[PDB]
Amino acid sequence: SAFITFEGPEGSGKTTVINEVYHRLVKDYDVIMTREPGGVPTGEEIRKIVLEGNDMDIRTEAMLFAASRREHLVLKVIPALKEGKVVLCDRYIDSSLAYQGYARGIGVEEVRALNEFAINGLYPDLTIYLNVSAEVGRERIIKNSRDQNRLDQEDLKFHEKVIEGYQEIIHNESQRFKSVNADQPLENVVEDTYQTIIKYLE
Amino acid sequence: MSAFITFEGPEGSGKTTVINEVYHRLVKDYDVIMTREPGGVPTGEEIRKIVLEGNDMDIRTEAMLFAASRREHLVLKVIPALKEGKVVLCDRYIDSSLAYQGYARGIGVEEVRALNEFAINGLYPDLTIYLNVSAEVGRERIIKNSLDQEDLKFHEKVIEGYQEIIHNESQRFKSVNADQPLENVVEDTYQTIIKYLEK
Numbered sequence: 001s002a003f004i005t006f007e008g009p010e011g012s013g014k015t016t017v018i019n020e021v022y023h024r025l026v027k028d029y030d031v032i033m034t035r036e037p038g039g040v041p042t043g044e045e046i047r048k049i050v051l052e053g054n055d056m057d058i059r060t061e062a063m064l065f066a067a068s069r070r071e072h073l074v075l076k077v078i079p080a081l082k083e084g085k086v087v088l089c090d091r092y093i094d095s096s097l098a099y100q101g102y103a104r105g106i107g108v109e110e111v112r113a114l115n116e117f118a119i120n121g122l123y124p125d126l127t128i129y130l131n132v133s134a135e136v137g138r139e140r141i142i143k144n145s146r147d148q149n150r151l152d153q154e155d156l157k158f159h160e161k162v163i164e165g166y167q168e169i170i171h172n173e174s175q176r177f178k179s180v181n182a183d184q185p186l187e188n189v190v191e192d193t194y195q196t197i198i199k200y201l202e
Numbered sequence: 203m204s205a206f207i208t209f210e211g212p213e214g215s216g217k218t219t220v221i222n223e224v225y226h227r228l229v230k231d232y233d234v235i236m237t238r239e240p241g242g243v244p245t246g247e248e249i250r251k252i253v254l255e256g257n258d259m260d261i262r263t264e265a266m267l268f269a270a271s272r273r274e275h276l277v278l279k280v281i282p283a284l285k286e287g288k289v290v291l292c293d294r295y296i297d298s299s300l301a302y303q304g305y306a307r308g309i310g311v312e313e314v315r316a317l318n319e320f321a322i323n324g325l326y327p328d329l330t331i332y333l334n335v336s337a338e339v340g341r342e343r344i345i346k347n348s349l350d351q352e353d354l355k356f357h358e359k360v361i362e363g364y365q366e367i368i369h370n371e372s373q374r375f376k377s378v379n380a381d382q383p384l385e386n387v388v389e390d391t392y393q394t395i396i397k398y399l400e401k
């Protein structure tokens with residue numbers, strides 16, 4: 001069994017990548033594609049309070065992500081792993097570390113401690129990081145709305161802090177981290193990602 | 203100026219009725235507000251609802267939801283009131299989590315205390331009234347309002363849990379004998395609070 005997570009800032013093409021990678025693997029392996037809360041009832045309710053998020057304490061936000069993470073992990077990830085499946089997970093602990101910890105400013109280690117209580121030490125066997133530059137990310141983001149409003153000074157600077165945050169987390173731990181160049185065209189990002197995962201599975 | 207006073211106690215301690223009457227006595231001489239989590243806080247209420255409805259919910263998830271609701275309530279209601287110099291009477295706070303999720307549920311008091319430290323950011327109560335009722339008295343008052351055995355044994359673990367938390371911090375803690383008739387528990391509780399606000 002293998003618990004593989006995918007992390008990356010906005011505009012890294014993560015969602016389309018994980019989707020195509022999964023379609024390639026589904027044939028040769030017993031692989032499931034998932035994302036938090038991933039259909040978990042309680043997890044879904046918890047997550048709904050967040051996206052319809054109107055300036056809720058960042059600490060509350062952090063905790064809700066942690067709580068949703070827990071439900072999903074226990075009710076969906078762990079069971080799958082016990083059945084010997086390969087679990088492809090769109091975002092995990094690292095997302096919280098980068099977004100709530102670094103970008104939001106709560107403090108990476110403080111948020112990592114919160115999540116340790118949630119994941120009980122169950123870290124990913126492998127974590128693919130789609131390393132896209134802020135500029136490339138920004139371009140992918142605008143082509144998906146083509147009317148830049150949701151993209152202003154702060155929005156753009158926040159997206160930079162996130163990347164900075166990832167750079168920090170990836171720096172300390174590179175044991176479970178395997179990076180990929182998300183600055184390339186998406187077809188190449190997928191191939192590279194696929195290869196990285198096949199190697200690990202061999 | 204302001205005082206953050208919490209009330210803790212197991213089931214059947216008469217806590218709710220106590221805080222209510224104590225509050226009515228203070229409302230006259232002090233600028234006091236009576237609250238409970240989530241205390242009408244929108245986000246807090248939504249979070250609490252999930253606890254209310256959920257069945258066999260993972261205890262750690264439960265603990266985190268209580269912590270998340272605690273945060274909203276603290277920041278959107280308690281802190282603001284304290285900055286306005288009010289006396290805040292709060293029905294249950296961090297200690298409830300330590301006793302129920304930490305001790306009784308078995309997650310571990312310190313592990314749950316750490317979770318909540320992230321939530322309250324070190325904002326502990328100025329005073330915490332503990333309604334010390336025995337399991338047996340609690341059982342009776344409860345039977346008097348409304349159920350089983352391992353539920354009766356859980357009620358005991360909670361009390362045990364409270365016993366543990368109490369004599370590790372008798373700085374905030376001020377105990378009251380909830381085994382007495384409710385009228386007496388209220389008087390004692392009121393006096394303990396007036397002494398603290400007077401000194």
Ligand SMILES: Cc1cn([C@H]2C[C@H](O)[C@@H](COP(=O)(O)O)O2)c(=O)[nH]c1=O
Pocket residue numbers: 015036065090091092093095096097099100
């Ligand atoms: C899982 C997770 C997501 N997020 C955010 C970042 C993403 O913009 C969003 C989920 O978007 P996505 O479905 O496109 O990956 O939620 C956090 O801030 N912290 C977390 O722990």
Ligand SMILES: Cc1cn([C@H]2C[C@H](O)[C@@H](COP(=O)(O)O)O2)c(=O)[nH]c1=O
Pocket residue numbers: 213218239268294295296298299300302303
């Ligand atoms: C505030 C809080 C309550 N509880 C429980 C115990 C009580 O039975 C219930 C609230 O009931 P009450 O309003 O009568 O005090 O929720 C916890 O388990 N943890 C907490 O942190």
